[PDB]
Amino acid sequence: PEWYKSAVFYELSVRTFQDGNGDGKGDFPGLTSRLDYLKNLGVDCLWLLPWFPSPLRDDGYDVADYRGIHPDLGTLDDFKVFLREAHARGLWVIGDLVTNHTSSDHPWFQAARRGPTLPDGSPNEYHDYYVWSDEGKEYADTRIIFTDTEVSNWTLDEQAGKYYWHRFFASQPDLNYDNPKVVEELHGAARFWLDLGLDGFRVDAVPYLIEREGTSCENLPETHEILKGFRAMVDREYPGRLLLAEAAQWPEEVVEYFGTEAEPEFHMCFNFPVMPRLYMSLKREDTSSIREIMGRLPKIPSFGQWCIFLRNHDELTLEMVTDDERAFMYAAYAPDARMKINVGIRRRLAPLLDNDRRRIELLNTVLLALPGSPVLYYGDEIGMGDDLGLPDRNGVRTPMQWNAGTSGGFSTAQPSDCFFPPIQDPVYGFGRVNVQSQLQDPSSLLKWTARQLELRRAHPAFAHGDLTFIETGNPAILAFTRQYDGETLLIVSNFAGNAQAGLLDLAPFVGRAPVTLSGASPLPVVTGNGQYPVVMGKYDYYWLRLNS
Amino acid sequence: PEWYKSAVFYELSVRTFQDGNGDGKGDFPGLTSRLDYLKNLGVDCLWLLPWFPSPLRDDGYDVADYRGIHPDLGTLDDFKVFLREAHARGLWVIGDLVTNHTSSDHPWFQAARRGPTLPDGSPNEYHDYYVWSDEGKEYADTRIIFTDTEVSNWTLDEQAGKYYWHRFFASQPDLNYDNPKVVEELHGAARFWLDLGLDGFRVDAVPYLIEREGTSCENLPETHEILKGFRAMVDREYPGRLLLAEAAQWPEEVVEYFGTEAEPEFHMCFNFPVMPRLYMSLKREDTSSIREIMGRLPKIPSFGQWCIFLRNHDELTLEMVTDDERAFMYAAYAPDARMKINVGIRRRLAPLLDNDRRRIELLNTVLLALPGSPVLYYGDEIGMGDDLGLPDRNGVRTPMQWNAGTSGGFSTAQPSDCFFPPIQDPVYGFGRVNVQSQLQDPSSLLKWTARQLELRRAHPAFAHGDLTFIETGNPAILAFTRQYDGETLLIVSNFAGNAQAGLLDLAPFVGRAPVTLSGASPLPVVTGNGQYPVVMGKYDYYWLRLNS
Ligand SMILES: [Ca+2]
Ligand SMILES: [Ca+2]
Ligand SMILES: [Mg+2]
Ligand SMILES: [Mg+2]
């Protein structure tokens, strides 16, 4: 199978991982100096947030130059050294390709805003790189994504005297994919990095490329067409590289981003649909929403693999759940107003779960056991918290906590000189939560996570198996099998905070002998009608093999 | 009904708990400021280590004055205010009555060593307070308790020109209980504290009062007779006060220390027999030793209550297990030979259990679920570590860790000026393990402990019920009922580190449903032959009641 199917991904922000030069900003030399940590954790692929020059109004997702390294992060040479060192350790690396929009500081937009013709009457070739309007009335009733900042998807530019489209901040003007030149520019950006040996891209905001009058301006066939263009380019010119889509949409919309066997699109898509139902099922002590949303996911192509995740650098998005699920989620996971942003919840995993290690482990087990390749958000493996005093979504992007020394080991500069301040509170601060402590503590979360990955790695059915949900007679207990190449796994998870009984329907496995993956402790052989009783402790996870 | 049967005890050392004035030494005004913490935790009775003037060669168990407060700890006025403040909050307080021996700095012994006659020719009345010998040849083949330090139970006093007896350090000369004045002096010392309102005593080293030639000089009938005299004195003069015995002896010798209905002795005795079997069963993944040692304990009198404990200010003693068991325990729990002392292991609870919170909870639940009144060792409720850099047993006696401030909040004195240095290592240090963190952390060990005590408190069967072991079909799974006043609890505990299947013998409860004590979730009703299948995750504890 393709490499990305067997990978474990790790998401990090270079500016926030390791400062290698004392200026309070993370950088590539710093990242390079920490690759053994990632190697030894059990990670195979690093996904780096945007590393491009940018005034950072959306933390680098406002790109000013696609073919450069932001000066905070070092130089292109540093980037090539990093990539060489990552590759030498068996780490693949993917970048973040921001296709839908650029910074307003990008030279193209600086050019475009002069208007349709240059001062001397000549056509301004860059004007058409962006999406302009006389009165900002096209595409009405299309949704606003950054609901807490933007009141419209059109903003008046003072210099051009016309409106320009933007699905995100006003400082992120949308690119005009009806202009063939724009398409070519982004194929070119992609080539630049793939020519350096980058293993692929996470592609940002894929559903919003094309706008059409009388549509939602999301998931349009025309957008898919373009994305297939990217795939074909990579298949012809860079065989084996990964395209991974950020498509935060309903199940049936998301699965379209894989394309077809005849017309391939992405290799991978994040499982956005399952992610909120994990947190919901935990609070409701009822896992039906997980089965229901997985059941709405169509079959994907041969080459396709889901990318499973718990959290990421953004808020926990609630955009694609119902109004009642959303309200439930806010009540359960955002009791203070400042915890919410833009139709979502800007908190880290450990805080979301009351720092309850039994729950954190539970959800990580499900992360690793569902069909796909999992992605860890940096620092969740040590139980980092958040800083909701920081604006926007920056409170989940505080510096990695390496040790208890100056600024959590992130930098030799003092905390208050760090790009974002390293967490110091009594619960989650680097005094208490840091890699070094957890390397010495035999029972740490760091250790637990590396061990759980090693356990996953010893059973390829987690990465490659099919999935079948098993009836349990108790909504609190989730059970499924993963089968691949002669091994059947049975995964049984209790989402309730107290002990629970179930009656598993193991009819198809009469005469099979369940044993724990860890140590092969035997459970009773399945007999009779195969209705198999279980009890589980609070937040328990049973990882089993059904010997044939 | 008697208060001590319903109490949760907490063992602490005043010198090591809270320093109020900043000299590096814990004191009474300091302890007084922390009474709300102990109350809120769910503690009812404080047992304080010896608070008496002493040169501290055995950390205060070498008493130089039975009727004062050691200057380190404040004044007798401080003690009274402390006692008033504890009672004001509905706490009980017991002290540590050191009956077997005094410090060699005690004036009695300073007098005694001058010999039978004073310089004025008069007889020396203090000489017979201690146990003298011309050649130290009596009582040979008595066990030496401090095996790592002492070569003999006799030591030649150079002034007296004679040998004196000591079961502990040579600086702890044994008192002569065949002298009736000695008995009266210790009745008087007891009176002194009981008249101030002290609620009782923990009585130190009770098996060793009387020596007799041709015996082991432990547990002799004459020693029990003396102890019965303390009980009579208390029952007549101070009804309701507690006498708790430290007798580290085999089951049938320990039970002797309760006395009988007709001839009462101690109200409570520490359950030394079960303590080492908890740890051994965890590492063996086999609980049969717990059932065997509990089964070997005779019924105790009506007024009697066991005091159950996991650890204390001493080493985990292995003196009263078999050679095979001892070798097993050393291998499992003393990987470094420095961790051994006096036929036991000088480590704290959390380190012993590899800081595994799942195991720490399991053993704590077992401690709370077995018959008796539990005693918690200060700092175990936050997961304190140990410091083997300190001599003797002092490595488990480091200052309590309140916050991440100056010396873990124990003192404004620097760590190196504290009586014992606060732990500062990366795993257990005060930056990582402290009260204030755990008060803010919704899922801390501290909160967990408070909540589990609350749960225990809501079910009087734990404090007062009978006990009946239940067949499980799996030695890893321990199961028992506790029955009292119309309620039957069912407590099931997995001592293995992976999932285990069981088949519980619940034939006596066909037609009843087990339900969780926590959150009232019912489990399937018992039916048919009452053989009840369970599965348990690693180190799970199921606290259930059996409904009608
Ligand atoms: Ca667009
Ligand atoms: Ca004696
Ligand atoms: Mg830097
Ligand atoms: Mg002091």
Numbering used by the authors:
A (entry chain A), B (entry chain D): 6 to 553
Task: Quote what the paper states about this structure.
Trehalose synthase (TS) catalyzes the reversible conversion of the inexpensive maltose into trehalose in the absence of any coenzyme. DrTS consists of a catalytic (β/α)8 barrel, subdomain B, a C-terminal β domain and two TS-unique subdomains (S7 and S8). Domain C and sub­domain S8 contribute to dimer formation, while subdomains B and S7 serve as a gateway for the opening and closing of the active site. In the present study, we have determined crystal structures of the wild type and the N253A mutant of TS from Deinococcus radiodurans (DrTS) that reveal a closed conformation for intramolecular isomerization.
The four or eight subunits in each asymmetric unit did not display significant differences, with root-mean-square deviations of 0.3–0.4 Å for all Cα atoms. The peak was assigned as a Tris from the crystallization solution, which contained 300 mM Tris–HCl, forming hydrogen bonds to Asp63, His106, Asp209, Glu251 and Arg398. In addition, the interaction networks between subdomains B and S7 seal the active-site entrance. Disruption of such networks through the replacement of Arg148 and Asn253 with alanine resulted in a decrease in isomerase activity by 8–9-fold and an increased hydrolase activity by 1.5–1.8-fold. The N253A structure showed a small pore created for water entry. In the N253A mutant, disruption of the interaction between Asn253 and Glu324 results in movement of the Glu324 side chain to create a small pore for solvent entry to the active site. This may explain why the N253A mutant has ∼11% of the isomerase activity and ∼180% of the hydrolase activity of the wild type. Similar to N253A, the R148A mutant shows ∼12% of the isomerase activity and ∼150% of the hydrolase activity of the wild type, suggesting that a small pore for water entry may also be present when Arg148 is replaced by alanine.
